[PDB]
């Protein structure tokens, strides 16, 4: 928003630094579509993409790989994007936000992918800029969620092909929310599996997985609340750039985000219940082990005491050669064992 | 400290003069950096402590398991040995079979039976 770019320490002034971790790949896809035709174009040359700024027909530019700060700088300079917006584009450790300017709207969103057989939740920040007839979109790496919008434009399906760029911004945001729902389904399946495992067999892997799931759910909450806020901001007023015809769609997406937030809060509560269940189950197992150990200890320590009796080398044995002394002490053996077994059965151990 | 620097570059009284405002803005951005780093470190350290609880609390169970198994195996065997060996030593004088190997075989059978009975429900 401000003209002056932020001044970091240890960096030469006026520098822009990519913040994330992905540097493998870079590619620019352009999908220019009109009422009667479309075009597709995948290159790594920024110059062939720049003239699409002033095209009357809507344009979709997808620049994947923002570690190339030079490409981001060139696109921002040509499109008139302020330097601070570019800094926010390159900053990854940033919660979702929406910013309104005179000639464009800048939206920061976040994707998510869940990995099977290795439960880790990963995030990737995508930025969208709606300028004039174009929708710039910046991505960290190959792999996104907007394939359905691509196919809809390719096959002239729906009302997307006959509308302006704001409907394209809608399509992308709704696809992102849809894959949020997909992620929630994956997480719910994992929660069911974890529930069965913890309730059936308490192990260290169980608490490891459950705590990782808890951290992931907290991260999801922290990501999903500002996204609801920014969709609210997109459908409340949005004066300059977004037409009044497209606001019911943004309202629909806002409702979807409300549902997602409710679901993630339910998941948090369920996971807390799972942690309590694990603690109770482990306490019960330790109690059972103590029951067993105490049973044998209580039925054998007095036995060792009576074995120590008649085990002392004293001159005067009362039953020094009494007949059936071993049978009578074994009878006392059996009687004591039986009576302690009966007594412990009274308390239902 | 961030609030102080904000006051310095925003209120800008005539004593501070206009030419030095950008330098105070730079220092404000540095304070922003510091605060963000402190908050991130706070989150990391708070996360670290829960890992310690996740670690040590998963040791008492194993220690208790090994103590339970060793005690429940070696106390009854100690009793059997104590019965078979005393200073009273009023026992059948004639050896019959190999008495000591038979006693050892009984010891091993009892130990194996106790081991098999354990971990049936995976309590160990």
């Amino acid at each position, epitope marked *: 928003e401000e003209k002056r770019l932020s001044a970091k*320490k*240890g960096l030469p002034p*006026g520098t822009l*630094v*990519y913040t994330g971790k992905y540097r493998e790949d870079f590619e620019i896809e352009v999908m220019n579509y009109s009422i009667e035709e479309f075009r597709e174009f995948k290159t790594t040359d920024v110059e062939s993409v720049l003239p699409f700024r002033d095209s009357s027909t809507p344009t979709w530019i997808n620049i994947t790989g923002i570690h190339r*700060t*030079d490409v981001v700088q060139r696109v921002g300079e040509f499109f008139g994007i302020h330097p601070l917006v570019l800094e926010d584009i390159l900053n990854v*450790h940033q919660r979702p936000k929406v910013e309104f300017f005179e000639n464009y709207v800048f939206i920061v969103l976040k994707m998510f992918t869940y990995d099977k057989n290795l439960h880790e939740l990963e995030s990737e920040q995508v930025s969208l800029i709606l300028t004039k007839n174009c929708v710039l979109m910046f991505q960290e790496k190959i792999g996104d969620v907007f394939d359905p919008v691509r196919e809809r434009i390719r096959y002239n399906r729906g009302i997307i092909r006959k509308k302006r760029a704001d409907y394209l911004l809608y399509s992308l945001i709704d696809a992102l929310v849809d894959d949020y729902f997909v992620l929630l389904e994956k997480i719910d399946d994992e929660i069911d599996v974890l529930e069965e495992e913890v309730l059936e067999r308490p192990e260290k892997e169980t608490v490891q997985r459950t705590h990782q799931l808890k951290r992931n759910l907290v991260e999801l909450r922290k990501t999903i609340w500002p996204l609801r806020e920014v969709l609210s901001s997109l459908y409340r007023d949005v004066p300059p750039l977004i037409e009044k015809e497209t606001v019911p769609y943004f309202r629909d997406v806002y409702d979807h985000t409300i549902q997602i937030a409710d679901t993630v809060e339910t998941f948090r509560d369920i996971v807390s219940g799972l942690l309590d269940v694990y603690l109770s189950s482990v306490s019960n197992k330790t109690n059972e082990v103590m029951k067993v150990l105490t049973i044998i200890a209580t039925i054998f320590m007095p036995l060792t005491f009576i074995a120590g009796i008649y085990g002392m080398n004293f001159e005067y044995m009362p039953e020094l050669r009494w007949k059936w002394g071993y049978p009578v002490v074994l009878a006392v053996m059996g009687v004591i064992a039986v009576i302690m077994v009966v007594y412990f059965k009274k308390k239902k151990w | 400290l961030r609030e102080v620097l904000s006051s310095l570059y925003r209120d800008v009284p005539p004593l501070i003069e206009k030419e030095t405002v950008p330098y105070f803005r730079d220092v404000y951005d540095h304070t922003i950096q510091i605060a*963000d*780093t402190v908050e991130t470190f706070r989150d990391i350290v708070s996360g670290l402590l829960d890992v310690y609880l996740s670690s040590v609390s998963n040791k008492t169970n194993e220690v208790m398991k090994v103590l339970t198994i060793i005690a429940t195996i070696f106390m009854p065997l100690t009793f059997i040995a104590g019965i078979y060996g005393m200073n009273f030593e009023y026992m059948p004088e004639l050896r019959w079979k190999w008495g000591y190997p038979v006693v050892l075989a009984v010891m091993g059978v009892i130990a194996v039976i106790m081991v098999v009975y354990f971990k049936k429900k995976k309590w160990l």
Partner: antibody, heavy 123, light 106 residues
């Protein structure tokens, strides 16, 4: 696609002065930082200078501070290193490198040299 | 000034065995440590940056670690083509400083 080519060295009298030119192809000198790294004959790598042509920020090692002056021309896409009062110890294979900044924490940043030039010899 | 102590000065090992090269810094450099490979008569090649991140286009056998002020470079499954000199480079300050080097030989 990215190449860095150095030239302008090979022989000079002690106390002499000369300029080494690094030519950038495939990238813009004003969107990155250009470093000079020298390797003495049978020795290890040593950092000399670095310029960020966007703002003209210059940083010099204590060994060659004041003697060496680094500069960059944006239109020419070339970065120079004009040595002065050059000694006998200064002989090395002077490399030209391109670096990008990365992120560790909000307060700490690091840079790593990804593309290197072939280097030139100075005696 | 920040100095990086790269020990040992030179190491020898066979092919197919794990080799670790360590490096130590005189003071607190957060993580701005990079590893370079220089074959004889050639320009260096970056392998590890941020002391733990493997540079793109570099085989996955190479790896790095940081333990406070100690930094190590490991080669899990050594290959015949992994014979060169390796340097640890701090970059916390604007005065970049390299390490002495560690030549790997047969």
């Amino acid at each position: 696609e990215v190449q860095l080519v150095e030239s302008g060295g090979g022989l000079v009298q002690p106390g002499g002065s000369l300029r080494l030119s690094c030519a950038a192809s495939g990238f813009n000198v004003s969107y990155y930082s250009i470093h000079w790294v020298r390797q003495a004959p049978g020795k290890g790598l040593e950092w000399v200078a670095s310029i960020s042509s966007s703002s003209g920020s210059t940083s010099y090692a204590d060994s060659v501070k004041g003697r060496f002056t680094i500069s960059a021309d944006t239109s020419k896409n070339t970065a120079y290193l004009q040595m002065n009062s050059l000694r006998a110890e200064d002989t090395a294979v002077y490399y030209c490198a391109r670096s990008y900044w990365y992120y560790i924490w909000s307060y700490s940043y690091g840079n790593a040299m990804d593309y290197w030039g072939q280097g030139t010899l100075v005696t | 000034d920040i100095q990086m102590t790269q020990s040992p000065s030179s190491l020898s090992a066979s092919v197919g065995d794990r080799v670790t090269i360590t490096c130590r810094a005189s003071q607190s450099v957060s993580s701005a440590v990079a590893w370079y490979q220089q074959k004889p008569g050639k320009a260096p090649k970056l392998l590890i940056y941020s002391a733990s991140s493997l540079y793109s286009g570099v085989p996955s056998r190479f790896s790095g670690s940081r333990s406070g002020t100690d930094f190590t470079l490991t080669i899990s499954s050594l290959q015949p083509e992994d014979f060169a000199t390796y340097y640890c480079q701090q970059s916390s300050s604007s005065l970049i400083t390299f390490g002495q080097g560690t030549k790997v030989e047969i």
